[PDB]
């Protein structure tokens, strides 16, 4: 978190633009200096941990970033004044870590500072009290999992936790359920067992072929090979066909974006606006790891087809449904 993630969080963040003249701020390399506590007079000084516990004092190492400020004022002259090592705040430090003060001191030394060599470390003395952070288990991400809901009309449903790699916290959960032999058959038009996909930032569920077309790949053949790779199986054609004819003429990519845009937010303002947000939402919110770049959504298409294909595998019984307790499906 100190050695690498912190530099990555400051280094990679939106540039500060504020403008007539405009002002630009760029962050550089974070420096973190050993824990130091400055007394009433203020001589900054070292804080061997024993003192911190006794004087009810938090253990924190000063964090200093470097920011360079360049201003363009329509004079076309650039003055990137550099401020270096500017206080941003203080980060808590685990004891016995590469960045603590007890790191690698031979036993005679720890004993001189009134610390115990046998003691494990790995705790934060916050407010003069040691705090241990319990590792908290999480559901695994990046994997198409198929879990079957007993009560709902969805015979099977597949989900992908969406994570983008040391970049952004929001994670999405595209679901690609099938409406086959579930709950009450009701109507749902003549078509039945239709693959349907909830998506991030939408209103009503979207038929799958449409999403694929909207990403593009309008040709119904293209959509089919992107999902079912081999056309030899007889059972496969029957399974992928009811949904294949959800409807059509949604073939213009823009038309499709509009249908999903109308299938989104609230009573649509205008097609042009509806197309704009829906167009950008699919590029970033959906499948961020597969296609972080807005361009070349080709990678996104292969993964979207994969989730549909894995749901089909569960239906035909080729691959057994997944488990929610396996410790590999947990991070």
């Amino acid at each position: 978190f100190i050695q690498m993630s912190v530099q990555r969080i400051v280094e990679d963040a939106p540039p500060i633009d504020l403008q007539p003249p405009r002002y630009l701020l760029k962050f550089e390399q974070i420096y973190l200096s050993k824990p130091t506590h400055w007394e009433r007079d203020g001589a900054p000084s070292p804080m061997m941990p024993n003192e911190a516990r006794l004087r009810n004092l938090t253990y924190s190492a000063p964090l200093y970033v470097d920011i360079t400020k360049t201003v363009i004022k329509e004079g076309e002259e650039q003055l990137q004044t550099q401020h270096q090592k500017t206080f941003i705040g203080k980060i808590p430090i685990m004891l016995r870590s590469t960045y603590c003060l007890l790191n690698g001191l031979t036993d005679r030394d720890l004993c001189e500072l009134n610390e115990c060599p046998l003691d494990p470390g790995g705790y934060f003395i916050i407010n003069g009290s040691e705090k241990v952070l319990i590792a908290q288990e999480k559901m695994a991400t990046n994997t198409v999992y198929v879990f079957a809901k007993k009560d709902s009309k969805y015979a099977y449903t597949g989900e992908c936790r969406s994570c983008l790699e040391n970049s952004s916290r929001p994670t999405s959960t595209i679901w690609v359920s099938m409406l086959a032999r579930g709950g009450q058959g009701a109507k749902k038009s003549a078509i039945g067992q239709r693959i349907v996909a909830t998506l991030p930032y939408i209103k009503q569920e979207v038929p799958i072929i449409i999403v694929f077309r909207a990403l593009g790949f309008v040709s119904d053949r293209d959509i089919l090979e992107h999902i079912i790779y081999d056309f030899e199986d007889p059972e496969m054609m029957e399974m992928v066909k009811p949904s294949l004819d959800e409807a059509f003429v949604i073939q213009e990519q823009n038309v499709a974006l509009n249908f999903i845009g109308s299938r989104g937010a609230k009573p649509g303002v205008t097609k042009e606006k509806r197309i704009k947000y829906a167009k950008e939402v699919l590029q970033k919110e959906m499948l961020p790891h597969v296609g972080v770049s807005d361009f070349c959504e080709t990678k996104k298409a292969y993964f979207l087809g994969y989730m549909v294909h894995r749901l089909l595998l569960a239906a035909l019984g080729r691959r057994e449904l997944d488990d929610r307790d396996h410790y590999g499906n947990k991070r």
Binding site: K187, K188, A247
Partner: protein, 134 residues
């Protein structure tokens, strides 16, 4: 055979400068386009986007004789540059850099925009199927 014993040796040159930035055109082979049928062509950047980024619009054999849309590939020199190798009268080879990759897809004849009303008509047909019951 001549080609079965075709041993040769030439000289390659990538001129640092070119008076014709070379790119890549990309039609489909499943289409098997007869280039001989192309008496003429027009080639302009696509107007939907209302320059170097603009998709191409190719009009062959008149405005509606033949028309294709070319869409730029994501990358072309992201890891490896692409070169055009051409044979010269001196036998030596000349290499030309590929600036860009454009994908030319055969355009649907009908074109136009179906609009919300066409989508609503599909929804109305779905509603009629929903209406049927006992």
């Amino acid at each position: 055979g001549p080609s079965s014993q075709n041993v040769t040796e030439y000289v390659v040159r990538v001129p640092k400068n070119t008076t014709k930035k070379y790119n890549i055109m990309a039609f489909n082979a499943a289409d098997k386009v007869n280039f001989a049928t192309w008496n003429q062509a027009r080639l302009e950047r696509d107007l939907s986007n209302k320059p170097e980024d603009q998709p191409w619009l190719l009009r062959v054999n008149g405005k509606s004789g033949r028309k294709f849309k070319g869409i730029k590939k994501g990358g072309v020199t992201e890891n490896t540059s692409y070169y055009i190798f051409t044979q010269c009268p001196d036998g030596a080879f000349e290499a030309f850099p590929v600036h860009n990759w454009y994908n030319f897809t055969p355009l649907a004849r009908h074109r136009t925009l179906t609009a919300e009303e066409a989508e609503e008509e599909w929804e109305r047909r779905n509603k009629v199927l929903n209406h049927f019951s006992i």
